[PDB]
Structure 1
Amino acid sequence: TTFRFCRDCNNMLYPREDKENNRLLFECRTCSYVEEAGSPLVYRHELITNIGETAGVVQDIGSDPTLPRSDRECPKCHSRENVFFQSQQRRKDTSMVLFFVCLSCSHIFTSDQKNKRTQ
């Protein structure tokens, strides 16, 4: 989604349709502000989420002693130095796929041999 606020109010924006020119706007319900929409998408639900998997990957991730290490060669820098964890999306369903974070290039690679990622 990614929504905007009113400059002047800082209050949130409500969508208004410009019936005449068939176009979407964003009105402020505290002042007389109006701005045209960036995207046609107003609301996104998302039931089968993937946002949470690689959360809290601070560059300090290597400083956690609790995290386990592996000798897996990186797809980028080919470094056999990396820390690993499972999908941080705390759901029942969730697969046991592993996320490896490079102790040099910091690139996040997975063990998923069914699908190919970029997060």
Structure 2
Amino acid sequence: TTFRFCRDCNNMLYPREDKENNRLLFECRTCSYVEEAGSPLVYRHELITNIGETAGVVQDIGSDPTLPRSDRECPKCHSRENVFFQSQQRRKDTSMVLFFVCLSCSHIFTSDQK
């Protein structure tokens, strides 16, 4: 789904079809470089998504003092310290699932059990 660029000239490649050999050949519209396509996938709309509650993590989230602190442990390092905080996505139907990030194992883990 990514947008490849011509390695000779950093420009947006377009799909264009072979006339007889029946293969998608990503030909550069700037220069004459051409490349065959790995998959027949071209375009993808994705009218439904549910993604974005997790990321935005820096390696020193816990360096900020404003996050609360708890005593549930990380289930890799068993250290009782932790930093917990809710979703990073904000829609009107995002969940009250929680995200728990530790300093020792430096790992992200949740509290869902379905």
Bigger mean CA offset, 47-56 vs 10-19? 47-56
Of Structure 1 and Structure 2, the greater strand share is in: 1
Deviation at 1:44, TM superposition (A): 3.2
Deviation at 1:101, TM superposition (A): 0.9
- Deviation track 1:24-83 (CA, whole Å, cap 9, x = no partner) reads 232211111111223443233334434322222111101111111221121222222211
SS of the aligned residue for 1:71 comes to: coil
When normalised by structure 1's length, the TM-score is 0.80
Contact preservation (8 Å) 1:50, 1:89: no
Aligned residues: 114
CA distance in 2, matches of 1:110, 1:28: 45
Bigger mean CA offset, 6-15 vs 30-39? 30-39
Contact preservation (8 Å) 1:52, 1:88: yes
CA distance in 1, matches of 2:48, 2:84: 23
SS of the aligned residue for 2:14 comes to: strand
Q: Hey, which bits of structure 1, 4+ residues long, moved more than 6 A? A: none
Counterparts in 2 of 1:18 and 1:77: CA distance versus 1, 3 Å = farther
Deviation at 1:19, TM superposition (A): 4.6
Larger radius of gyration: 2
Cα RMSD between the aligned structures? 2.4
When normalised by structure 2's length, the TM-score is 0.83
Paired-residue identity, %: 99
- Deviation track 1:7-30 (CA, whole Å, cap 9, x = no partner) reads 122001111223533332322111
Unaligned runs of 5+ in 1: 114-118
